[PDB]
Curated annotation (Swiss-Prot), chain A:
GO terms for cellular component: cytosolic large ribosomal subunit; preribosome. Its main location: cytoplasm. One of its GO terms (biological process) is cytoplasmic translation. Coiled coil: none annotated. Component of the ribosome, a large ribonucleoprotein complex responsible for the synthesis of proteins in the cell. The small ribosomal subunit (SSU) binds messenger RNAs (mRNAs) and translates the encoded message by selecting cognate aminoacyl-transfer RNA (tRNA) molecules. The large subunit (LSU) contains the ribosomal catalytic site termed the peptidyl transferase center (PTC), which catalyzes the formation of peptide bonds, thereby polymerizing the amino acids delivered by tRNAs into a polypeptide chain. The keyword Glycoprotein does not apply. Pfam families: Ribosomal_L27A. Keywords: Cytoplasm, Ribonucleoprotein, Ribosomal protein. PROSITE patterns: RIBOSOMAL_L15 (PS00475). There are 2 genes for uL15 in S.pombe. This is Large ribosomal subunit protein uL15A. The lineage of its organism: Eukaryota, Fungi, Dikarya, Ascomycota, Taphrinomycotina. It comes from the Eukaryota.
Curated annotation (Swiss-Prot), chain C:
CDD domains: Ribosomal_L32_L32e. Component of the ribosome, a large ribonucleoprotein complex responsible for the synthesis of proteins in the cell. The small ribosomal subunit (SSU) binds messenger RNAs (mRNAs) and translates the encoded message by selecting cognate aminoacyl-transfer RNA (tRNA) molecules. The large subunit (LSU) contains the ribosomal catalytic site termed the peptidyl transferase center (PTC), which catalyzes the formation of peptide bonds, thereby polymerizing the amino acids delivered by tRNAs into a polypeptide chain. It comes from Schizosaccharomyces pombe (strain 972 / ATCC 24843) (Fission yeast). This is Large ribosomal subunit protein eL32A. Component of the large ribosomal subunit (LSU). Mature yeast ribosomes consist of a small (40S) and a large (60S) subunit. The 40S small subunit contains 1 molecule of ribosomal RNA (18S rRNA) and at least 33 different proteins. The large 60S subunit contains 3 rRNA molecules (25S, 5.8S and 5S rRNA) and at least 46 different proteins.
From Swiss-Prot, chain E:
Its main location: cytoplasm. Belongs to the universal ribosomal protein uL30 family. Component of the large ribosomal subunit (LSU). Mature yeast ribosomes consist of a small (40S) and a large (60S) subunit. The 40S small subunit contains 1 molecule of ribosomal RNA (18S rRNA) and at least 33 different proteins. The large 60S subunit contains 3 rRNA molecules (25S, 5.8S and 5S rRNA) and at least 46 different proteins. Keywords: Cytoplasm, Nucleus, Ribonucleoprotein, Ribosomal protein. One of its GO terms (biological process) is cytoplasmic translation. GO terms for cellular component: cytoplasm; cytosolic large ribosomal subunit; nucleolus; preribosome. The chain holds residues 126 to 250 of 250 of the full protein. Component of the ribosome, a large ribonucleoprotein complex responsible for the synthesis of proteins in the cell. The small ribosomal subunit (SSU) binds messenger RNAs (mRNAs) and translates the encoded message by selecting cognate aminoacyl-transfer RNA (tRNA) molecules. The large subunit (LSU) contains the ribosomal catalytic site termed the peptidyl transferase center (PTC), which catalyzes the formation of peptide bonds, thereby polymerizing the amino acids delivered by tRNAs into a polypeptide chain. It is found in: Cytoplasm; Nucleus, Nucleolus. This is Large ribosomal subunit protein uL30B. One of its GO terms (molecular function) is RNA binding.
Curated annotation (Swiss-Prot), chain F:
GO terms for cellular component: cytosol; cytosolic large ribosomal subunit; preribosome. This is Large ribosomal subunit protein eL18A. One of its GO terms (molecular function) is RNA binding. The keyword Ubl conjugation does not apply. The modification Phosphoserine is found at S2, S50, S115. The chain holds residues 15 to 151 of 187 of the full protein. The keyword Phosphoprotein applies.
Length: 94, 120, 117, 52, 125, 130
RNA sequence: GUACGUGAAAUUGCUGAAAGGGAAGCAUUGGAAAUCAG
RNA sequence: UUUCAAUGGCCCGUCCACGGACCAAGGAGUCUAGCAUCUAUGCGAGUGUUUGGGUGAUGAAAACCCAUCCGCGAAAUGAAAGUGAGGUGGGAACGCCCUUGUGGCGUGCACCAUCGACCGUAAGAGCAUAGCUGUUGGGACCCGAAAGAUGGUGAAACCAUCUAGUAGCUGGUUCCUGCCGAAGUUUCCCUCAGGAUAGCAGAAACUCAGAUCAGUUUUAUGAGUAUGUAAAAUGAGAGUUUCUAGUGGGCCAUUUUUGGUAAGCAGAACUGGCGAUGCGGGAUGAACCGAACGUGAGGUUAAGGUGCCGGAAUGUACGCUC
RNA sequence: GAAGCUCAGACGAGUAGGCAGGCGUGGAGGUUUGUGACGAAGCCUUGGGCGUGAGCCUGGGUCGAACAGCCUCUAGU
RNA sequence: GCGAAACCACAGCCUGGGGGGCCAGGCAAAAUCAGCGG
């Protein structure tokens, strides 16, 4: 815009990405949330955090109490026990 | 969507009926009653209106409604007046009594100068 | 309401008289000792907003009508509402055939034409 | 004048689609059609659909 | 006119002439030049409703009550005189003494001239 | 600011509606809303659905600005919100899981004087480097 | 009319009008003459 | 329009000096990359299609659609292994009263605080685009300096390139009106030039309807007619945190003042006004006397004046002088 | 024309700088059922009108083929 | 008969006061030729 300029009005004057437990349940499809969360079923979900872009899970947030299996390359010391009272286990990738 | 959002499009600056002059602006639309870019005048802007025009030594009034406002072919309803001047004033104002009467003055004014044009 | 113009004579640029290269059009001086900019005695007068004319009588000819420029007859039909306050002015390039159409139409509509001749 | 001026301008694809939806919707308001300049005082109805 | 105004008018002694107004001078000034600071505006006292709408709390209703509160210097002198926009007077009819900027006692026209303000304000209206 | 800096024609309708309410009622709600419609985008930061849920359980909720969504929280309470805009995720969560969403023109129809409405705001920090 | 579309200004010649005693130019206000409008 | 009369009017730009014989055309803050702020638009824990692929028969270099990736954000901290997250006060708005109201009563967003904790977290706010402005780099607003380098042509000079070489500097820099409007100086840091913080000028976001301020003076003093201090008169709505310009010259006159002498002086501290300012008077005038300026009408003044030039008493009264 | 209308009061110097609103220039998209050999654009004029202003419109003359108002885009303005 | 160029803000009378332009005075008649100061 050379019409609105100031010269116009001057003419004439001189690799470990992080995820947390609060976000953990969102990585799973919205459909299976409605059939694994809040329902007592023998089969537990699998949340392969690796296959979404993270290598480590951190301990932020609270946990819904459904036992859940989480696949991670890495896990915080205070992340893994938080899922223990949640009933799930960390499964470590080779 | 409705009369005010259409107003801020057709009315305010760009239309195919606007004439901006030395310090003000007119409204070329035939169905206008003042010739000015005003809400109480612009039909593109507003719902039902009434205004008069001249044809070959004769006058005609145009009217519109709201249920029909989406069907432009028969949107305007015309009535032909070819009897007399003072009769035309009464034929117009009588049909707009159930109608808000703020613009009866403008309507009655228009017939007079249309009649004056026929004389002159 | 009548007309009063706060000033009739135009504004001429300083030294416009002295030089042909200096136009007869107003440019505000920028010198820091310019007697014209410092508004000395007997110097030319700089335009101010104080000279502005009355709002109710602005853009009005000495007969109280605002000049509306007319190109064809469909423009004169617009002045139908405002014959008592606007004067129709014919555009300067309208041919002789159209010009008489406009003047005759304006005469029928009772709209004054500034340059009917 | 150089040839490596900025000739083309990036626009978010979403506001491109907002613009089309807005302009399509405005294509279905008879009043907006008249100001745009279309002599459709005798068009049967808006939007004017025709047989296949 | 109190003790805190004695020195008020000594520091600007050469710039002001001040004196004691009689009844007539106080009367004419408000009647002919009476503008009340209303809503931060200089509205003339065209009628008593303007004063009441502004000074109703202080039991001041009409101009004369306002004149009375001024002349007698009542309990509400501060609010009334603060409500009075500084009177804008005209350069006196007939002019001043030649050397206007000397002290009045010395043949000038500055400073305390006592009652003679009542002989001057007539020229200034 | 006497008018918003946006050429949004729909915003000028909200201001026009809420310029009428500002001068024609004693509702201090209306004056507050009208002033906040004038403020820029930087001064109308987003509020979250969760934060609203916390603030209601800590009445129609009114926030000028946007109401985003919080994916961290799962089961949304019943809420009645009225905001300038809603993100698609937030609107689905409020509507499907419980209550309903409103708008400032509807909210004026509901509570022209703002009776029984809570006027929340979002953390005005942006980046805040130091 | 080939010194060729339009043909500005500086610049010059004539014609008409006007003023000019060691400046002119300009400004405000009016007269005189010229001219225009409503 | 032209001329005439009355009053007025130093030649413009630039920094005395330099430029200007006259005219027409040309002629200077541009494009672009990065960054920063602000406003708008789209979306929102996301966001960005335009490297590509698809597709487009009618302008197919456009529009339209999209796969995997990737950028920024979604978590920090340590140098690194590694590890890796409240209640009190006010307070915006609402409800509530007693019966208005006041006030009380709840409710408390933002934010501010105190007073608390968790490893910065504490219920994420960004991403893209366009615009404005600032700044840095590119020829970098336009013009302009003495050398040099390469490769040549003559007999060190010459020629075309590098080359739009180098600027701390010189000169110029193009339309109008309106609003607001300074500093012209302390502070420090500082090898060097400067850098500063502050003040003056603004723009946005938030408190009390205040006894909150004041180039003011009082009240009370205490001490030495003065001095400072704290605590009624008068006026005014007073505030604050955040950033962004411009400025840090000098001249004139007063106060003391110590050092001075044919006599000037010499030196500070201090105060103003001019510096950005026309106007009346002083015959003429940078600082003197008046007065701060929209465009006009009438009235009336200031300083200065009333013999004539010259608007206004060849006024009144009492005196001195050849 | 809610960007409007209406009542009221105060204020008007202004360099550095700060701030808003407008006038003109070449091209682009849209629009005006726009102007034109019955004379476009230009140019001239002791012709007129408008605006505080940049500027605009017009009468007459000259002239011969294209031009403009409005909303917006762009700059070798 | 042929026929330049430098140069050119505008010009050109002196005394006194602040220089040729300002203030107060003295004066003030065209057009020109020749020698020649500043």
């Amino acid at each position: 815009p050379t019409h609105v300029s100031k010269t116009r009005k001057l003419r004439g004057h001189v690799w470990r990405p992080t995820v947390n437990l609060d976000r953990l349940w969102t990585l799973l499809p919205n459909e299976a949330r409605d059939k694994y969360l809040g329902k007592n079923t023998e089969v537990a979900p699998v949340i392969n955090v690796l296959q979404s872009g993270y290598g480590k899970v951190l301990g932020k947030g609270r946990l819904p109490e459904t036992p859940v299996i989480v696949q991670t390359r890495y896990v915080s010391r205070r992340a893994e026990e938080k899922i223990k009272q949640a009933g799930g286990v960390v499964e470590l990738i080779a | 969507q409705q009369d005010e959002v259409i107003w801020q499009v057709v009315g305010h600056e760009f239309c195919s009926y606007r004439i901006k002059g030395e310090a003000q602006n007119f409204c070329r639309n035939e169905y206008n009653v003042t010739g000015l870019c005003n809400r109480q005048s612009c039909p593109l802007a507003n719902s039902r209106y009434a205004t008069v025009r001249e044809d070959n030594g004769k006058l005609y009034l145009y009217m519109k409604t709201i249920e029909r406002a989406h069907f432009p072919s028969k949107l305007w309803q015309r009535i032909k007046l070819s009897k007399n001047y003072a009769k035309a004033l009464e034929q117009i104002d009588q049909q707009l009594l159930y109608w808000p009467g703020r613009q009866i003055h403008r309507c009655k004014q228009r017939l007079t100068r249309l009649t004056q044009y026929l004389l002159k | 309401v009548n007309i009063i113009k706060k000033r009739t004579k135009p504004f001429k640029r300083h030294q416009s008289d002295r030089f042909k290269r200096v136009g007869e059009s107003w440019r505000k001086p920028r010198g820091i000792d310019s007697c014209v900019r410092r508004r000395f005695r007997g110097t030319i007068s700089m335009p101010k907003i104080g000279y502005g004319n009355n709002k109710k009588t602005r853009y009005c000819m000495p007969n109280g009508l605002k000049a509306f420029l007319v190109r064809n007859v469909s423009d004169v039909e617009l002045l139908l509402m405002h014959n008592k306050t606007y004067a129709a002015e014919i555009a300067g390039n309208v041919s002789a055939r159209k010009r008489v159409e406009i003047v005759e139409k304006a005469r029928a509509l009772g709209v004054k034409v500034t340059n009917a001749g | 004048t150089k040839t490596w001026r900025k000739w083309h301008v990036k626009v978010n694809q979403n506001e491109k689609r907002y613009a089309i939806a807005s302009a399509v919707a405005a294509s279905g308001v008879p009043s907006l059609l008249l100001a745009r300049g279309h002599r459709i005082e005798e068009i049967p109805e808006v939007p004017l659909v025709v047989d296949d | 006119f109190n003790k805190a105004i004695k020195e008020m008018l000594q520091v600007v002694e050469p710039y002001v002439t001040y004196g004691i107004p009689n009844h007539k001078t106080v009367r004419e000034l408000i009647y002919k030049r009476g503008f009340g600071k209303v809503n931060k505006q200089r509205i003339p006292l065209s009628d008593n409703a303007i004063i009441e709408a502004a000074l109703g709390k202080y039991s001041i209703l009409s101009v004369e009550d306002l004149i009375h509160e001024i002349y007698t210097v009542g309990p509400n002198f501060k609010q009334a005189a603060n409500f009075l926009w500084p009177f804008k007077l005209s350069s006196p009819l007939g002019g001043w003494r030649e050397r206007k900027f000397k002290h009045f006692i010395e043949g000038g026209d500055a400073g305390k001239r006592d009652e003679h303000i009542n002989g001057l304000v007539q020229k200034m209206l | 600011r006497s008018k918003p800096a946006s050429e949004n024609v729909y915003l000028k309708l909200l201001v026009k509606l809420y310029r009428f309410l500002a001068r024609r009622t004693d509702s201090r709600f209306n004056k507050a809303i009208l002033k906040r419609l004038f403020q820029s985008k930087t001064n109308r930061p987003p509020i979250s659905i969760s934060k609203i849920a916390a603030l209601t359980s800590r009445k129609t909720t009114v926030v000028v600005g946007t109401v985003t969504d919080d994916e961290r929280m799962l089961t949304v309470p019943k809420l009645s919100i009225a905001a300038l805009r809603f993100t698609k995720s937030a609107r689905a969560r409020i509507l499907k899981a419980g209550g309903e969403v409103l708008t400032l023109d509807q909210l004026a129809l509901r509570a022209p004087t703002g009776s029984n409405t809570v006027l929340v705001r979002g953390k005005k920090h942006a980046r805040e480097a130091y």
